[PDB]
Each structure stands twice: as C-alpha cells, then as structure tokens.
Design a protein around this motif. Structure first.
Motif, PDB file in Angstrom:
ATOM      1  N   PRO A  79      98.900 118.325 -14.610  1.00  0.00           N
ATOM      2  CA  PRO A  79      98.509 117.308 -15.575  1.00  0.00           C
ATOM      3  C   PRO A  79      97.145 117.535 -16.215  1.00  0.00           C
ATOM      4  CG  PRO A  79      98.513 116.428 -13.344  1.00  0.00           C
ATOM      5  CD  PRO A  79      99.239 117.755 -13.292  1.00  0.00           C
ATOM      6  N   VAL A  80      96.204 118.169 -15.485  1.00  0.00           N
ATOM      7  CA  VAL A  80      94.873 118.434 -16.008  1.00  0.00           C
ATOM      8  C   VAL A  80      94.965 119.409 -17.173  1.00  0.00           C
ATOM      9  CG1 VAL A  80      92.567 119.422 -15.523  1.00  0.00           C
ATOM     10  CG2 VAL A  80      93.575 117.856 -13.886  1.00  0.00           C
ATOM     11  N   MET A  94      96.419 117.540 -20.239  1.00  0.00           N
ATOM     12  CA  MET A  94      95.429 116.621 -20.787  1.00  0.00           C
ATOM     13  C   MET A  94      94.354 117.395 -21.536  1.00  0.00           C
ATOM     14  SD  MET A  94      95.971 113.327 -20.256  1.00  0.00           S
ATOM     15  CE  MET A  94      94.357 112.806 -20.808  1.00  0.00           C
ATOM     16  N   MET A 102      93.877 117.236 -25.461  1.00  0.00           N
ATOM     17  CA  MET A 102      92.795 116.374 -25.901  1.00  0.00           C
ATOM     18  C   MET A 102      91.608 117.195 -26.396  1.00  0.00           C
ATOM     19  SD  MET A 102      90.808 113.477 -23.663  1.00  0.00           S
ATOM     20  CE  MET A 102      92.371 113.336 -22.815  1.00  0.00           C
ATOM     21  N   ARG A 104     100.958 101.818 -18.071  1.00  0.00           N
ATOM     22  CA  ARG A 104      99.559 101.632 -17.707  1.00  0.00           C
ATOM     23  C   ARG A 104      99.147 102.644 -16.638  1.00  0.00           C
ATOM     24  NH1 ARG A 104      95.421  99.897 -20.254  1.00  0.00           N
ATOM     25  NH2 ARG A 104      94.478  99.221 -18.282  1.00  0.00           N
ATOM     26  N   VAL A 105      97.946 103.241 -16.795  1.00  0.00           N
ATOM     27  CA  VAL A 105      97.363 104.119 -15.781  1.00  0.00           C
ATOM     28  C   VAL A 105      97.582 103.471 -14.415  1.00  0.00           C
ATOM     29  CG1 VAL A 105      95.478 105.806 -15.479  1.00  0.00           C
ATOM     30  CG2 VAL A 105      95.345 104.170 -17.375  1.00  0.00           C
ATOM     31  N   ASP A 106      97.291 102.151 -14.363  1.00  0.00           N
ATOM     32  CA  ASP A 106      97.307 101.300 -13.175  1.00  0.00           C
ATOM     33  C   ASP A 106      98.667 101.313 -12.469  1.00  0.00           C
ATOM     34  OD1 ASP A 106      94.719 100.588 -13.900  1.00  0.00           O
ATOM     35  OD2 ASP A 106      95.082  98.416 -14.022  1.00  0.00           O
ATOM     36  N   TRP A 160     104.476 110.362 -19.615  1.00  0.00           N
ATOM     37  CA  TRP A 160     103.326 109.502 -19.902  1.00  0.00           C
ATOM     38  C   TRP A 160     102.049 110.332 -20.106  1.00  0.00           C
ATOM     39  CZ3 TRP A 160      98.819 108.886 -17.284  1.00  0.00           C
ATOM     40  CH2 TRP A 160      97.985 107.856 -17.725  1.00  0.00           C
ATOM     41  N   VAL A 199      99.961 110.334 -23.597  1.00  0.00           N
ATOM     42  CA  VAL A 199      98.596 109.837 -23.744  1.00  0.00           C
ATOM     43  C   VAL A 199      97.623 110.955 -24.108  1.00  0.00           C
ATOM     44  CG1 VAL A 199      99.042 107.858 -22.221  1.00  0.00           C
ATOM     45  CG2 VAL A 199      97.810 109.837 -21.294  1.00  0.00           C
ATOM     46  N   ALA A 213      95.273 110.548 -27.498  1.00  0.00           N
ATOM     47  CA  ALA A 213      93.843 110.817 -27.540  1.00  0.00           C
ATOM     48  C   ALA A 213      93.485 111.768 -28.689  1.00  0.00           C
ATOM     49  CB  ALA A 213      93.386 111.352 -26.202  1.00  0.00           C
ATOM     50  N   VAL A 269      89.268  98.395 -22.472  1.00  0.00           N
ATOM     51  CA  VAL A 269      90.451  99.208 -22.334  1.00  0.00           C
ATOM     52  C   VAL A 269      91.714  98.344 -22.318  1.00  0.00           C
ATOM     53  CG1 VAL A 269      91.336  99.968 -20.040  1.00  0.00           C
ATOM     54  CG2 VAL A 269      89.659 101.372 -21.328  1.00  0.00           C
ATOM     55  N   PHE A 270      91.671  97.197 -21.610  1.00  0.00           N
ATOM     56  CA  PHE A 270      92.827  96.321 -21.479  1.00  0.00           C
ATOM     57  C   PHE A 270      93.177  95.681 -22.813  1.00  0.00           C
ATOM     58  CE2 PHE A 270      91.976  96.626 -16.987  1.00  0.00           C
ATOM     59  CZ  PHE A 270      93.243  96.616 -16.449  1.00  0.00           C
ATOM     60  N   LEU A 326      89.355 104.894 -22.132  1.00  0.00           N
ATOM     61  CA  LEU A 326      90.704 104.971 -21.620  1.00  0.00           C
ATOM     62  C   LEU A 326      91.138 106.432 -21.470  1.00  0.00           C
ATOM     63  CD1 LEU A 326      93.063 103.377 -20.595  1.00  0.00           C
ATOM     64  CD2 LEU A 326      93.832 102.994 -22.954  1.00  0.00           C
ATOM     65  N   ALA A 327      90.729 107.309 -22.394  1.00  0.00           N
ATOM     66  CA  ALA A 327      91.009 108.744 -22.281  1.00  0.00           C
ATOM     67  C   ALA A 327      90.363 109.329 -21.018  1.00  0.00           C
ATOM     68  CB  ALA A 327      90.537 109.444 -23.527  1.00  0.00           C
ATOM     69  N   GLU A 371      89.739 107.618 -18.287  1.00  0.00           N
ATOM     70  CA  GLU A 371      90.513 107.165 -17.135  1.00  0.00           C
ATOM     71  C   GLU A 371      91.727 108.076 -16.937  1.00  0.00           C
ATOM     72  OE1 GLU A 371      91.625 102.995 -16.850  1.00  0.00           O
ATOM     73  OE2 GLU A 371      89.717 102.296 -17.697  1.00  0.00           O
ATOM     74  N   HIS A 372      92.329 108.480 -18.052  1.00  0.00           N
ATOM     75  CA  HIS A 372      93.510 109.320 -18.023  1.00  0.00           C
ATOM     76  C   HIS A 372      93.183 110.661 -17.377  1.00  0.00           C
ATOM     77  CE1 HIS A 372      95.516 106.762 -21.449  1.00  0.00           C
ATOM     78  NE2 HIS A 372      95.595 106.114 -20.308  1.00  0.00           N
ATOM     79  N   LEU A 373      92.089 111.284 -17.813  1.00  0.00           N
ATOM     80  CA  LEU A 373      91.598 112.520 -17.227  1.00  0.00           C
ATOM     81  C   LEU A 373      91.362 112.332 -15.723  1.00  0.00           C
ATOM     82  CD1 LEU A 373      89.233 113.511 -20.172  1.00  0.00           C
ATOM     83  CD2 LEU A 373      91.017 115.001 -19.257  1.00  0.00           C
ATOM     84  N   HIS A 396      92.618 110.180 -13.567  1.00  0.00           N
ATOM     85  CA  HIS A 396      93.932 110.101 -12.956  1.00  0.00           C
ATOM     86  C   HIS A 396      94.518 111.498 -12.725  1.00  0.00           C
ATOM     87  CE1 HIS A 396      98.377 109.493 -12.910  1.00  0.00           C
ATOM     88  NE2 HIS A 396      98.019 108.574 -12.032  1.00  0.00           N
ATOM     89  N   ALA A 397      94.494 112.361 -13.734  1.00  0.00           N
ATOM     90  CA  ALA A 397      95.043 113.698 -13.616  1.00  0.00           C
ATOM     91  C   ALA A 397      94.372 114.491 -12.494  1.00  0.00           C
ATOM     92  CB  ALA A 397      94.917 114.430 -14.930  1.00  0.00           C
ATOM     93  N   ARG A 448      95.456 113.226  -9.091  1.00  0.00           N
ATOM     94  CA  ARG A 448      96.839 113.518  -8.768  1.00  0.00           C
ATOM     95  C   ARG A 448      97.003 115.001  -8.511  1.00  0.00           C
ATOM     96  NH1 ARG A 448     100.231 109.670  -7.333  1.00  0.00           N
ATOM     97  NH2 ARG A 448     101.988 110.934  -8.084  1.00  0.00           N
ATOM     98  N   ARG A 472      85.518  99.374 -13.764  1.00  0.00           N
ATOM     99  CA  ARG A 472      85.318  98.743 -15.061  1.00  0.00           C
ATOM    100  C   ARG A 472      84.454  97.482 -14.919  1.00  0.00           C
ATOM    101  NH1 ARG A 472      91.123  98.611 -14.649  1.00  0.00           N
ATOM    102  NH2 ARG A 472      92.087 100.541 -15.374  1.00  0.00           N
ATOM    103  N   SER A 530      91.918 101.713  -9.565  1.00  0.00           N
ATOM    104  CA  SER A 530      91.083 101.238 -10.654  1.00  0.00           C
ATOM    105  C   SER A 530      90.762  99.763 -10.427  1.00  0.00           C
ATOM    106  CB  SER A 530      91.806 101.465 -11.971  1.00  0.00           C
ATOM    107  OG  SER A 530      92.051 102.854 -12.173  1.00  0.00           O
ATOM    108  N   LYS A 557      92.703  92.597  -7.567  1.00  0.00           N
ATOM    109  CA  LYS A 557      92.827  93.798  -6.759  1.00  0.00           C
ATOM    110  C   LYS A 557      91.494  94.112  -6.084  1.00  0.00           C
ATOM    111  CE  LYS A 557      94.978  97.233  -8.940  1.00  0.00           C
ATOM    112  NZ  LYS A 557      94.808  98.327  -9.934  1.00  0.00           N
TER     113      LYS A 557
END
Ligand code: NAD
Ligand code: NAD
Ligand code: NAD
Ligand code: NAD
Ligand code: UDP
Ligand code: UDP
Ligand code: UDP
Ligand code: UDP
Ligand code: NA
Lengths: 321, 316, 318, 306
Positions: free
Chosen positions: A94-95, A98, A102, A136-138, A148, A152, A156, B129-130, B157-158, B160-162, B164-165, B168, B178, B241, B289
């Motif tokens: 995924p990195v 992204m 991006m 959602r990321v969440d 997803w 995303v 971006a 972001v929300f 938000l971008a 946060e996406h990074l 997450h990656a 994972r 936040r 998060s 949370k």
C-alpha cells in the motif's frame, strides 16, 4: 484556446503502458512524443511505432523530482499517466501505491509548472474516487482495503491538481476512465478472462452473488475523449468521467452478455468470493458530453466482439488460472 | 507494549511550535528530546527549558527527506507535528500547504520506518477531516476561506492515509491524533478564544462576522497534553485514530462570545458584522473511542478553562 | 395576488398558539372560522376571543365528514392542527402519526372539495430534512425515547408534505408548505428550553444542561414567524413552494443559549451539566435563503432582543 | 410462540390480488379465510378455490374505517396486502395512491388493534422505500406511501405491542400471471424472436423474487416468533441485475434470436440502492432457492402453455 494536436512536444509519464502506448500510436506521426517511464510495464516496445523518429524513451521514476523536472522542459502537452493500480500489488505494498500515485502526481505537477510552456496538463485519476467517500480510514477484506487505498491515492492527486490549477493557473484536466477494454489489452480483468473462457466453452465462475457492478469504456472511446480533453479549451480547470452509460453492468449480467454475443455454450457457475470488496457507486458522465462533446459510441455488443476478434487473432500471448 | 515515558529518545518534527514546546516541558526532565523544525514558528525559544541539556534543536525542513531520515536515527518515540495550518497562507499558497502536509508526512513516516527503532509514531492530523467529506474537489466555487480550510483538511487526510499504509505494510506502531482547537495558558494565540478573552477583559466590542452560527470545537491545553501522554504510552493506541477534545466545549461563535463575556463578568458588547468570506460547514466528530481506549476524558470545561486562560493573559 | 382583507378564512388548530396569534392580525378585516378540538386553547385568553368576525367549531381533523362540511366556501385554508409530544411523559407515536398524517389528508381533501380555496397553507416542521438520515428499522439505546419521539414527529410531518404535494400536482390545489423553526416569544408560557431557562434565570435558579450541551436548536421569534406567514399567505410566488422560516443568527447550542439568557437577563444562575434523561437524534437545520428571495422575508428579531421581550411578558404574566 | 398455520382465522386485505390469491391457495384447505378487498383487481375470481367453503369475500374499502374494524373482528392472523400497486393502478392518482396506502394501513392497523385477537399482523411494503412526469410521480408516490405505512406499523408495534412484521418483497415474478413487468414482456418477446427495446441507458437495477420463494418467506414470517417487530427484505441476492443485463440473460437462457435495441428515455434514471437480505436468513431461516435461470425457464414455460 483550441489546441491542434500536430506539431506539439508531448510529454507522457507512464507512456510505456497500455493507454500511453495507444495514444502514441495515434499521435506520433504528427508530434514529438517523450515517454517518461520506469518500465514496470512496457507495452510500447511491442508496437509498430516503437522506433519512430518522433518517439523518445526516457527511463525514469516520477518519484525522482529532479529528473522529471529536467525531462519535462519545453513540453507543451503534459500527460500524467504513471501510476500503480493493481489490487494485489496494493494488498502487498500500500505504501508504494500511495507514494507513487500521490507524490508522483505532485512531482509531475511541479515539473509541468516549472517548464513554463505547458498548454495542457492531463491527470489520469480513477472513477473509484466517487464511491470512496462513503468509507473511512477509521472503519471489509484485503481486496476492499486495497481498492480504497488505490482510490484515495488518486483522490489526493486530484487535490494537488486542483491546487496547481488554482494557485498557478496550470491548465489542468482531470481524466477518470472507467475500466478500459478492447483490442491491445492483454490483462486479466473480467472481460478478457470471460471472453477467453467463453470462446472455448469453458466454465465461467462468478465469485460472490454476481450482483457487483462494474462500468466499462471501450479503448477507442477513451482515446476519442482524451483527444478532446487534450484540445478543447473548455476542458481546462475541469474533471471528467470517461465511459459509456450503456456499459454499466453486474458481473453475472456481463457473463450472460459475453456468452450470448459470442454464441458461447459456456456454463456459468457461482463460487464463494475469495475476499470482501467495497461497493462503489458509478459516477455520471454527462459533463463529458456537455463540455468535451464526447459520448461513447461503442456499446458492449460491438466492443466485446471486436475484443474477442483481437483475442482470437493474437491467442499466443498470455495464460492464467 | 505499554511504554514508560522516561529514558526514551524522543524525536518531534514541528517541535518548536505550541504543542511540541508544551509537550517538551512535561518530558524533558526524564528524556532525550530532539526537535526537527524549520522555525517558521518558534515558541520553544521563549520557554525556560529552551536550553535544557536534554534538548537538541535541528533546524530542517520535513521536505528534506535525507536530512529528516538522518536526524531520526535511533528515535524510540517519533512525533510528527510539523505542518501548515494557516487559513490566510493556504488561500495564498494552497500548493505549499498540500506539499508540506502530505509530503512532509510521507517523509516523516519513511524516516521513522528507516530508523527501525520506533516504538510509537504519533501523527497530528486535524478534526476538519471529518467535515471535509461533505465537499467535492470538482464542486468547490466555499469562498476563499472555505476552499483554504478544505485544502488544509484534505492535506491532513492524505497524511492519515499514508500513516495507515505504513502501519499496515510495515507494522509501524502508529497513532493518529486529531486535536480539537487547543486553548489555554501558554497560547497567547490568535484564534477566537484568545482574541475574545482579550477583548472581553478590556470591555472592547466583540464583532461577530456573518450569522455567528458557525461551530468550533475546543480543548483545554492540559486535557490535550494528558491525552497525548496516553496516546504515546498505552498499547491500545497502536493502529488507531483519536479525536481529542471536550464534548462540552463545542459551541457556535456567537455562543462562545456570550460564554466568554458572562464567565469573565465583562461589559463588552457583542455586535454582528458582515462576513468577509464564506466558509465551509464542518461536523464535529465523536470523542468516545478516546475514552474507551486511552481512558481519556477531558476534565476542564469552558467556564474553568476560560477563567484559567484569562488569569494567565492578565498576569502577562 | 391575495389581499388579506374581506376573505373567508378557515384555520384548523386555530385555537392554538400560532393560530391565535394570526387571528389577532386578521380578524378585524376577515371572516374567520376556527376548527379545533381544544386539546390546547390559547385563543380563549385573547382579547378578540369573542369577536363578531370569529366562529369556533369544536371538531377533530380526524372526523373527515365534519371538516369537509365545515370548510365549505373557504378562500384561505390554513392547516395548523397537529400534535408533537416529543418531551411528553406518556409517548403516543400512534396519536402523533394519525393526527398529523391523516389530519393533513382530511384537511387537504376538505380544501379540495370546497372548490373555493385560493391558498392552502400547511404547517410542517424543519426536522423533515434530517429525518432522512435515520431508518425506521434501525431505531437501540442509540435513539432513546426522546430521539424516537422526535423522529415520529418529523416523519409524520414529512408524510403531510408528500400529501400536500400530491394535491398540488394532481388537482392544482394552491398549496404552501411552511416550516417554522421553533417559535418563542410573548403570548404563551411554553415548555421549551427558552421559556424554562428564562424562568430559572429570572429567579437566579440553577440551570441544568442535559448531556454535553452541544445540541443545536434554531429559534424564531413569534413576530418574525407571523410576518413570514402573512407574506406566505399573500404573495403569488409562494404557491407550490416550501419555506424554512427562521433566523440564521438564532441558531445556537443549548449551553450557548443558557449563557446568552443569563447574560442578557443579568442573572446569577449557575449553569451545570447533568447526564441526559434520554438519548436524542441529530437533525440538520435547513437553509433559509429561498424564503428571503421568494417571500421577501428576513427575520429581524435576534436572540438578545427576543429574550428580553419574552422575559418581560413572562414576568408581567406571573 | 411459534404459530402453526392451520385452524386459524386469517383476515387478508387485498386478498383478491396476485399475492393474496397465491397465499389463499396455500392456506385455504386448512384455515378460515376472509378477504377484504374492493376488487380494483380480482385474480381470485379466476381461481378454482374462489368459491371454497373456507373463504368469505367482503367487498370493502380499507378507507372505510368502521367497516374494516367490524370485518376484522376475531382475526388471529392479519395480512394487510390492500394497496394501489402496479404502475397500471398507481399512475392514476398520486392522491389515491398516497391515501389508500397510508391511511389504508393506519385503518388496517387500528382494525387489528381493536380486534384484540391478532397474533401476527403482516404488512406488505416495497423494496424501493430506501432509495418528473406522471409515471415518475406515481413511482415516487408509491415508495413514500409505502414508507409511511412502515412508520405507522412501527408506531403500533411500539405503543400497543401489536405483533407486526414488515415484509418487503423484491419484484415478484413467475407462473400464474401473464404479468406486467420487465420479465414478462421480455420473455414474451424473446420467445417470438421479437426485438426488445431498452429505454434509456439500460443501467437501471432491478432485483427479483421468484413467486414460490416469496410464499415460502411469507409462511416463515407469519409463524416464526423472531419475526415480530422486525422488517425483512425478501428476495434473491443472485437475482439483482440491470435491465440490459436481464434482457441478455433472458435471450441467452431461452436461445432467442431477439435483437436488444436501445431507445430514448426522456425520463431520468432512478438509481435505487438494493437492500441486503441477510436478516431474513438469520431470523426467518429464509434464503431464496430459485435463481434467475431456473425462474425464467419456469416463467417461460407457463407463458408458452398459455
Ligand atoms: N486502464 C484502465 O482501465 C484505467 C482505469 C482507471 C484509471 N486508469 C489510469 O490511467 C493511467 C494509465 O493506465 P494504464 O492502464 O495505461 O496503466 P499501465 O500500468 O499500463 O500504465 C502505467 C505506466 O506507469 C509506469 N510507471 C509505474 N510506476 C512508475 C513510476 N514510479 N515512475 C514512472 N513510471 C511508472 C508503468 O511502467 C506503466 O507503463 C493510470 O494513471 C491508471 O491508474 C486506467
Ligand atoms: N493547536 C491546535 O489547536 C491544533 C489543532 C488541529 C491540528 N493541530 C496540528 O497539531 C500539530 C501541532 O500544532 P501546533 O499548534 O503546535 O502548530 P504550530 O504551528 O505551533 O507548530 C508547527 C511547527 O511546524 C513547523 N514547521 C512548519 N512547516 C515546517 C516544515 N516544512 N519543516 C519543518 N518544520 C515545519 C513550524 O515552524 C512550527 O513550529 C500540527 O500538525 C497542527 O496542524 C493543532
Ligand atoms: N410552535 C412551534 O415552534 C412550531 C414549530 C414547528 C412546527 N409547528 C407547527 O405549526 C402548527 C401550529 O403550531 P402551534 O405552536 O400553534 O401549536 P399548538 O399546539 O398551539 O396548536 C395546534 C392546535 O391544533 C389543535 N389540534 C390538535 N389535534 C387536533 C385534532 N386532532 N383536531 C383538531 N384540532 C386539533 C390543538 O387543540 C391546538 O389548538 C402545527 O402544525 C405545529 O406542528 C410549530
Ligand atoms: N407484486 C410485487 O412484486 C410486489 C412488490 C412489492 C410490494 N408489493 C406489495 O405487496 C402487496 C400485494 O401485491 P400484489 O402484487 O398482490 O398487488 P395487487 O395490486 O395484485 O393487490 C392489491 C389488492 O388490493 C386491492 N385494493 C386496492 N385498493 C383497495 C382499497 N382501497 N381497499 C381495499 N382493497 C383495495 C386490489 O383490489 C387488489 O386485489 C401490496 O401491498 C403491494 O404494494 C408487491
Ligand atoms: O471470471 C471472473 C472474473 C472476475 N469476476 C469478478 O468480477 C469482478 C471484477 O473483476 P476484475 O478482474 O475485472 O477486477 P476488479 O474490477 O475487481 O479489480 C470481481 O468481483 C471479480 O471477482 C468473476 O466473478 N469471475
Ligand atoms: O472576534 C472574532 C473572532 C473570530 N470570529 C469568527 O469565529 C470563527 C473562528 O475564527 P478563528 O480566528 O478561531 O479561526 P478559524 O477557526 O476560522 O480558522 C470564524 O468564523 C471567525 O470569522 C468572529 O466572528 N469574531
Ligand atoms: O433546562 C433545560 C431545558 C432543556 N434542555 C435541553 O435543551 C434541548 C431543547 O429542549 P426543549 O425543551 O426546547 O425541547 P426539544 O427541542 O428537545 O423538543 C434538549 O436537548 C433538552 O434536553 C436542557 O439542557 N436544559
Ligand atoms: O422491455 C423492457 C421492459 C422495461 N424497460 C424499462 O423498465 C421500466 C419499467 O419496466 P417494467 O415493465 O418492469 O415496469 P414496472 O413493473 O415497474 O411497472 C420501463 O419504463 C423501461 O424504462 C425497458 O427498457 N424495456
Ligand atoms: Na382526541
């Protein structure tokens, strides 16, 4: 102003790939074309026009900001097509998806901006941007998370593209193809798999309940749109969904269409799905009609036949399971 | 994976700013701390621990990938606070906001990953972001302020996406954090609370721009710091998060002005004026949370926190 | 188009708060019939309660035959009969849905059969828009008793709107849909948050904030609502339209409202948080720009002024 | 608490139409059944059991509150199927659609309530509920008139403890009706190699339920105690497809030589989302067994024979 697609210096990141190879075939006789590509894929080398005098191949990574700036100097039409789109690739890394999508887009925008000569910047995004908003990321399976991630990463790039348009007046066009099928595509997506099975009357398996939706665009339709997007002044500052409203189907409905249109005797069988996916809604294509004057002309029956013809003509060049 | 916040090598991008400076105050006695910041802001210098033997300042940009990778070697707690959040600056240069926030965060994550020693990576995002999901890049027309706020939100938000990656793919032990807008002692500040308290204390007019119905969520500094300590330490934070703030400190701008003037016994008038620019509407997220997983619940409500802030502002 | 003089006006729920108030403004120059079951009765306390131009019919909007009969010859038909019961001790969703949904059907049909109606004004509610984010089959301690009763109310009004639209489209009934934000002001004691907090504040009694106090409520001062009503009843471009009737400056949180009330009224009341009695739902406040553009309405009484006028009325009447 | 569907007094509004006739056929041998219908439609009079000793027909309107209350007295199972439904009926009058569906459901609910004897009240809704000419107007009207009926049903269940089940079938198809839907017309054309017209881009989703599955679901909902207070999506998750996809499926499965031809729609597409059916499996033990291929063939067989 209207741009005439002759006598131009055209710069294409990702230009070695399917779409880029296709567009080159169409424009190379009348334009200087520079491909900037790291040759993760190389469709281009297997075309008639690979060695054309007007064609240049610069081997480079869009994550190399210095190298893309130099390579893009003087360019008049900048087409940003470099990306990673593979689901399985995205599950594993995924990195890289992204980052390439991006940061590669940032780097391409900056190169275009610094050139000072760009009359049109065309950014390839993806349709799944639309569906992606309702997740959602969440908050699905490996396939869903990877789709997803892909979506995303492309969104971006659209955000960056907008900022350059707004701040610097870069003449950008966001171009989001529905999944492209047609002659030229080798690939292992549903159409190419199902045609190949159907031609030999082999069983076609449906993973899941077969109700998942996919939209398609025939290759020649996507190309006609792209020429309009690259030329007409009304494209500038705008985003477009590029596909055929008549080529939106379920996977089960696609299998039935293919078997019918090819007069196949293939049996269609339901299997359990291998991974949960995310459900994305298909966007409207009207603005492409309104502003580009583009309306897809190749409906599924025609497209699938032309595709099956090319697959049969070229049956020695792939294999899958 | 419960981390004890002593004897650690802590690296903080953006560490010269408000939240970084404040967190350093609380950890510098018992930790090796490294700040990586280009000094666009510099609150840290004004602090009494600015020259603590445990503190190193590295002047650098988070866009300088080589330098940040090098600077982060050996770090055990990595806190990414560097960003551009200014509305007016984002109006003038949205590219700079997007670039610093997105690419700076990519570089921060890569530096943490390459170090191999990071036990907790905490990225500062933002609550907007929300809200931002309500809007569409190809729809923006928002006003200048709203398009700038959206630009800021999506840049985060971008990030946060990074983040997450990396979590994972590489198991980087990440936490997305936040903060609701932070107020209190130590921020002299420039946002509504700081401005409105200063007006109220001298019985100056408080002008409300537009209809006053725009929502803003707040968090008192000590609550935010407490949450940050939990996020940096507690194993349940890893891969999650958090929205950090006080559910009783969400109010309209008009409501805030009334609250500040009552609580401080001010004689200020509150007066409606025209808006200068349209803005985006943002929904405030849930903080549940953070209670469930960090054991964090904000203890300082606006009445107490506004008075504490005013005392500090008067004394200074 | 319509001049509000010399008209035969028929108002269901005319004995209530908004109905009563509107009667004060029109009764001098118009023949007015009130059709009401007297579940509430503001009207009886007003100076004009026994005016020569006023006729009361004690009737139920669920009595289809009576309302058709009563409505004969009406030129302006105003459908204000409704119940809510959101905060009531004894919850009756059946009563709310039947009175509001069926009452609206019976009113529309009474208007349609009379043939004489030039304007049909239906009261709905601002909550109809937010209601669409919840689903009947997914209502939980998520929703709570008050949440579910607020949803009941909202969907009962939304159904009324759908009915009103069907009569407009099919039969060309000249309808207007009017969605008041919560109305406050002189004329009634009231049980809403403004009334309750003003009475506490005036006596320096503790004001309690249920839950986290960030719940948003939008308020419309009574005189502003009546001004909008007068315009909706008259102006040609109102027909076939729906209007959100409020004040953009009087949208605040419940805590912010408390603070405003205490500051405006120079109270020493403490404001203290307590756990909510029941979980509630969150419903968006719609935009009011069309009301301005089409009716030429913009609310002129802001909260500070409105709260003072209300508090004065409450002090003089108790 | 499990209800056994023998020896019951069953009151069915709308019992003279398609679904009501079908259900009566399955239950009439072993139950006393009362049909309350105004006979806007009358499938029932064509059936061999139209004059069965266990069947009483009351010709009545669900808008007559006092009559339906009287008629439903003593009822143990109350099935509320009366509706203006099918575009043939609904296009006629938004007011009549909205009024019969909403008010008629209110009245049916009040009748069941006043009876005191109802052990199951089953309300038929429609799967469109959670999605500008006369035709689009009538479809929108149908959808919201049905959603309003769901609201009233909820209110009665909550306030009065009425043992309600909201039952939402996908579009029902199969033998026993020429029919009026896409499947009906497209099979007829396909069987004659007559060309099939697709109005619009053909991307419109439609989900389906085979008649026999719908009936099996209805039996579970009428009996199983876990059904009470719940709402169910009743259909086949494998029998969701586009209109164009459906045309291709019909022609292939029936070996037709029909051409499928696009034509203009001046109407705008309604992008209805199609609900999930898992809860029906979990709570009713119901999962659709007849998939499209098999259903289409049985349908074509019936259409051919007739
Ligand atoms: N083909 C479709 O159906 C489709 C659908 C949606 C979006 N798109 C987008 O259109 C564009 C072109 O798609 P395509 O089908 O031609 O894909 P492709 O994979 O054939 O072409 C992409 C090219 O990018 C190159 N590339 C990858 N990483 C690179 C890097 N870091 N630096 C430089 N070059 C790099 C690859 O070598 C390849 O030639 C992509 O942005 C893709 O996401 C395509
Ligand atoms: N304070 C709040 O209420 C709040 C609210 C939401 C989000 N946040 C986020 O929390 C973090 C910390 O907030 P803060 O209030 O302390 O902000 P701040 O502005 O005080 O601190 C940020 C620091 O980053 C530095 N910086 C900026 N660009 C940089 C770059 N390119 N390279 C290196 N350093 C750079 C600045 O010099 C500054 O010291 C930021 O990510 C901010 O967006 C804060
Ligand atoms: N006041 C507000 O803040 C507010 C807000 C939103 C919507 N509304 C709507 O505006 C309209 C009028 O509001 P109001 O504040 O005057 O309310 P109200 O309760 O004071 O008046 C409504 C009247 O309807 C009568 N009524 C109730 N059920 C009846 C029935 N079955 N048959 C006949 N009469 C019946 C009552 O006796 C009462 O006099 C209502 O539709 C209400 O839903 C009011
Ligand atoms: N058939 C489907 O695919 C389908 C799909 C979704 C929902 N439904 C619903 O299921 C139920 C049965 O469907 P169907 O296909 O059998 O419909 P239908 O039209 O065949 O049956 C409706 C019956 O109600 C009767 N009726 C109409 N108005 C009446 C009134 N005012 N008073 C009394 N009776 C009246 C008609 O005479 C008819 O017999 C309906 O509630 C319908 O909305 C059916
Ligand atoms: O023989 C096949 C090929 C694909 N699919 C399904 O059809 C969809 C589209 O698959 P494709 O390979 O085109 O890729 P995707 O769009 O999922 O990336 C997915 O749900 C696949 O599981 C299928 O059921 N049978
Ligand atoms: O005296 C003041 C200060 C702020 N604001 C408004 O309050 C909101 C918050 O402003 P702040 O300066 O806190 O920054 P923002 O959150 O908008 O970045 C904005 O709509 C400002 O216009 C106002 O009306 N009066
Ligand atoms: O003294 C009070 C009165 C009301 N409320 C809250 O204020 C809101 C509005 O209350 P109101 O009585 O006006 O009725 P509602 O709009 O909830 O029907 C609700 O969340 C109430 O719980 C409160 O916190 N304190
Ligand atoms: O052969 C057909 C049958 C139906 N439809 C389309 O599907 C809509 C609804 O068709 P159907 O017969 O299913 O109608 P319903 O059962 O909803 O009344 C029509 O208006 C057309 O747009 C079509 O294009 N071709
Ligand atoms: Na009553």
């Amino acid at each position: 102003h209207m741009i005439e697609l002759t006598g131009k210096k055209i710069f294409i990141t990702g230009g070695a790939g399917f779409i880029g190879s296709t567009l080159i075939g169409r424009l190379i006789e009348n334009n200087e074309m520079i491909v900037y590509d790291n040759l993760e894929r190389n469709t281009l080398k297997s075309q008639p026009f690979a060695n054309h005098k007007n064609l240049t191949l610069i081997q480079g990574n869009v994550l190399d900001q210095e190298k893309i700036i130099e390579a893009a100097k003087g360019s008049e039409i900048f087409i940003h097509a470099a990306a990673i789109a593979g689901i399985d690739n995205t599950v594993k890394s995924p990195v890289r998806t992204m980052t390439v999508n991006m940061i590669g887009t940032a780097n391409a925008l900056e190169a275009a901006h610094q050139a000072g000569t760009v009359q049109r910047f065309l950014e390839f995004s993806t349709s799944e941007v639309f569906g992606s908003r309702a997740y959602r990321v969440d908050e699905t399976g490996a396939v869903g998370e990877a789709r997803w991630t892909y979506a995303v990463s492309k969104l971006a790039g659209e955000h960056l593209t907008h900022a350059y348009n707004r701040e610097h007046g870069l003449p950008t066009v966001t171009f989001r193809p529905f999944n492209v099928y047609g002659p030229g595509q080798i690939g292992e997506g549903a159409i190419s798999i199902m045609i190949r099975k159907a031609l030999n009357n082999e069983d076609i398996y449906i993973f899941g309940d077969g109700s998942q939706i996919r939209a398609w665009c025939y290759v020649d339709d996507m190309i006609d749109a792209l020429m309009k997007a690259l030329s007409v002044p009304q494209a500038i500052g705008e985003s477009f969904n590029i596909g055929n409203a008549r080529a939106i189907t379920t996977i089960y409905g696609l299998a039935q269409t293919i078997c019918r249109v090819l007069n196949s005797k293939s049996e269609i069988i339901f299997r359990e799905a291998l991974s949960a996916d995310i459900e994305l809604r298909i966007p409207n294509v009207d603005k492409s009609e309104e502003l580009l004057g583009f309306k897809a002309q190749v409906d599924l029956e025609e497209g699938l036949i032309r595709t099956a013809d090319w697959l049969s003509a070229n049956m020695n060049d792939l294999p899958v399971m």
